[PDB]
Amino acid sequence: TVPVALVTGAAKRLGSGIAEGLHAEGYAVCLHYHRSAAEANTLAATLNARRPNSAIPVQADLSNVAPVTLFKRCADLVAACYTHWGRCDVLVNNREAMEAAAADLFGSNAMAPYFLIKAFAHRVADTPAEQRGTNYSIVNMVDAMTSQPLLGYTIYTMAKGALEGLTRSAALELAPLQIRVNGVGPGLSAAEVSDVVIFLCSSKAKYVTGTCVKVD
Amino acid sequence: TVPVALVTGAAKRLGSGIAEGLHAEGYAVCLHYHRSAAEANTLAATLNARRPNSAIPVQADLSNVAPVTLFKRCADLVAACYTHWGRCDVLVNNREAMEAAAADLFGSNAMAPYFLIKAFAHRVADTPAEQRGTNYSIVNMVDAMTSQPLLGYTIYTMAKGALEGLTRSAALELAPLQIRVNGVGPGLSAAEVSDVVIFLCSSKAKYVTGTCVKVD
Amino acid sequence: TVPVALVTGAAKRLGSGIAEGLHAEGYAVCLHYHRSAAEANTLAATLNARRPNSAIPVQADLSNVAPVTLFKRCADLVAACYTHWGRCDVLVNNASREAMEAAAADLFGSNAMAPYFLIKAFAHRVADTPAEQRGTNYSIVNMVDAMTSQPLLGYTIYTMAKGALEGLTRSAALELAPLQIRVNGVGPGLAEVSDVVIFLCSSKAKYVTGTCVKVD
Amino acid sequence: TVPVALVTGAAKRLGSGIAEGLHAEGYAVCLHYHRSAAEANTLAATLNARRPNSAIPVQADLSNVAPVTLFKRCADLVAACYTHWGRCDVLVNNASREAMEAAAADLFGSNAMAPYFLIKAFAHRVADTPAEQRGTNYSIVNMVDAMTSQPLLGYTIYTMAKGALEGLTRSAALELAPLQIRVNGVGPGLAEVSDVVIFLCSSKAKYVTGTCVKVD
């Protein structure tokens, strides 16, 4: 046993902090990326150097269109974890021009987590009982407006809403396989949300599912 | 003054009833369709015959991909109403194979209403003060599971959630232009929801916005 | 065989409107008051003037405090309808140092419990009526008032009270649904409101229950 | 300068766990009881056994009913911490014919108001402390119990009570945020729970407030 965490958007502002923090706790991290390959590798450099083969970068396109389906690209991201360490215990989902753009950011921000969670669960489902880890938890992040800046009020509230239903609904559907699913949002530092994430992923939080954490 | 209602999915089971009912009340209806052109025209036949030039069918593709954006296809649907009657007072939003499908049904069911509402409001915004109608209301329908049958529990709950936030958020954002926005869902006949829709669209409901109606 | 409506706090302001509006639709009205005799009798006379035997005033303390229990007082008020007219089809619940604090407690409990008990009695009376002898459209409306119109309450205790009342509405809807009794609420958005009341009570709302209507 | 925690209903079952758990983290604990003297003294002795001057029992009636007002009783219980230890940093609120009905009313008001008043007093004490002299981590936890563990309540009145309590949590969080006092809730999903309490009270939750944690 050494547990494994997949942090999507792992080189972004938040994701990195979550990643540093899950790694400090003794998790092996998969550091997901699209655009930011260099920073992925810096981060992987820093952690592996601190503790060897404890981190991998992995590129994945989390957009609405990459013809390869998002459903499949998502399943492949989770697969990177199994190929490389053979388990995945933790998932953290972190003008016409403008309009089509906002609609697409809406789609992947709801649909990527959905498919990343189908995938995560499918694998746990397939792992045999004896060889399953003991503490599977999924955290959906939701963000302030400042961090979804290319936004009007309304679209943001739609995305929060679906994310909100993802969390409560999977919490339920996925309890038979012992998978907790929780959320962290604002609120009506990076170091800060990280402690929440660490607690929800910790053994302390075994009986906690369905819960939308609020922060500041 | 004779008010105008746009009922998307207007030949489907529910939509038709809503349409017959808004028309009985004295609304001129635009009967939206994609696949079901024949039934659109039967319905238009029945109402115009009952009361002349009081109904038009209009085809629109409400899918996620029809390269023409949904944003634009939506704006064009609302435009059909203005071209033909010069006003629009009422909007009613009514295997990899399987997965991409569900993701797409998710996208258009959240995003079509969003863009149908941007469009509706834009026009009202552009109409001059003197020539605006007096009672603009928008109703978002949400449906039982039986009517979104190609579904798992979770996806359905995501869509409800975004729809839910659309309704509350626009209610707010769109109150300066006097546009009420409300929802009708189940519940935790066709004739039945129709009366709710008629009331929310009626002058009786002037001070009602933000409200999610529940039914049975 | 003319429907009967029980409006608590009929004597002054929102109560009167609602009673007046309901009366103008042809219910017989029972106008509860506590301290405002002039107002309840004046109003009842006016109404009885317009249509004979159509209104009565009925006195009750609905504060929270045998010396008579709140339950019994609430049961007798509901009984004053049967006695007088044979039936009761509609209930509208209008909410109305160390010293401020105990009074703010008393108020809180009074606003939650009086409706709770009223709803209990109403419903027990329905259940005692032989099956074939019941009315065809039982509905209950819980009014929530703006923070600004009940000045003795801090933000917190107000929210508490709003929370108790939403619970009762949603709870009682589910719990009474077998007796075909609908329970709904009118509250402020984020005779104005009498039309919503008329609607919820109307035969057109036969399937609306457990709804919190938002009015501003 | 050792932190002090006030647990209502410490005497039996969930209360004891929580007090025990909090105590095992090194708070000084004030163990409220009403009727169960044996339980509160036994437990306090055990704890004081393990570490001297680390626990005391303190008696209070927290029912809803000068003859002493609930407010004053709640103020004095909170005062029994200052008096004894100089400070109070953590509050945990554990909820615990015609006749059943009046008792079910009394219970309801007691469960909403006792916490409300407790939170008032706690917070007044914080505010009277000169600025530079306050503790660094004030937190409040409102426990909600399962329907099954408080048998005297119908579904409806329970939901009412749950609603009052969620209101207080979310309300008091916003209202006390200027005094750097956090308010959160633990409730059932749709020493198990002591770890969540420890967490919410811990320095790692400095930015968590207004959260309803869901535990089953």
Residue numbers in the entry:
A (entry chain B), B (entry chain B): 5 to 70, 82 to 109, 133 to 226, 253 to 280
C (entry chain A), D (entry chain A): 5 to 69, 81 to 111, 133 to 226, 255 to 280
What does the paper say about this structure?
The structure of apo LdPTR1 has been solved to 2.5 Å resolution. Ammonium sulfate was the precipitant for crystal growth and a sulfate ion binds in a polar cavity formed by the β1–α1 turn and the loop between β2 and α2, accepting hydrogen bonds donated from three main-chain amides (His38, Arg39 and Ser40) and Ser40 OG. This polar cavity is the binding site for the adenine 2′-­phosphate group of the cofactor. Since sulfate binding blocks the 2′-­phosphate-binding site, NADP+ is not present and this leads to disorder in the substrate-binding part of the active site. However, the residues near the catalytic site were poorly ordered in contrast to the same regions of LmPTR1 and TbPTR1, with no electron density corresponding to NADP+ or methotrexate, ligands that were present in the crystallization conditions in a fivefold molar excess. Missing segments include residues 70–80 (the loop linking β3 and α3), 112–132 (the β4–α4 loop) and 227–254 (the β6–α6 loop). However, the β4–α4 loop is well ordered in LmPTR1 but is missing in LdPTR1. This means that in LdPTR1, Phe113, which is a critical residue, is disordered. The absence of the β4–α4 loop vacates an area in the active-site cleft, allowing the β5–α5 loop of LdPTR1 to adopt a different position to fill the gap. We conclude that owing to the disorder this crystal form is not suitable for characterizing the interactions of LdPTR1 with inhibitors.
A promising target with respect to infection with Leishmania sp. is the NADPH-dependent short-chain dehydrogenase/reductase pteridine reductase (PTR1; EC 1.5.1.33). This enzyme is unique to trypanosomatid parasites, where it supports the provision of reduced biopterins that are necessary for meta­cyclogenesis and which are implicated in resistance to reactive oxygen and nitrogen species in Leishmania. PTR1 catalyzes the reduction of biopterin to 7,8-dihydrobiopterin as well as its subsequent reduction to 5,6,7,8-tetrahydrobiopterin. PTR1 displays a sequential ordered mechanism, with first cofactor binding and then substrate; following reduction the product leaves, followed by oxidized cofactor.
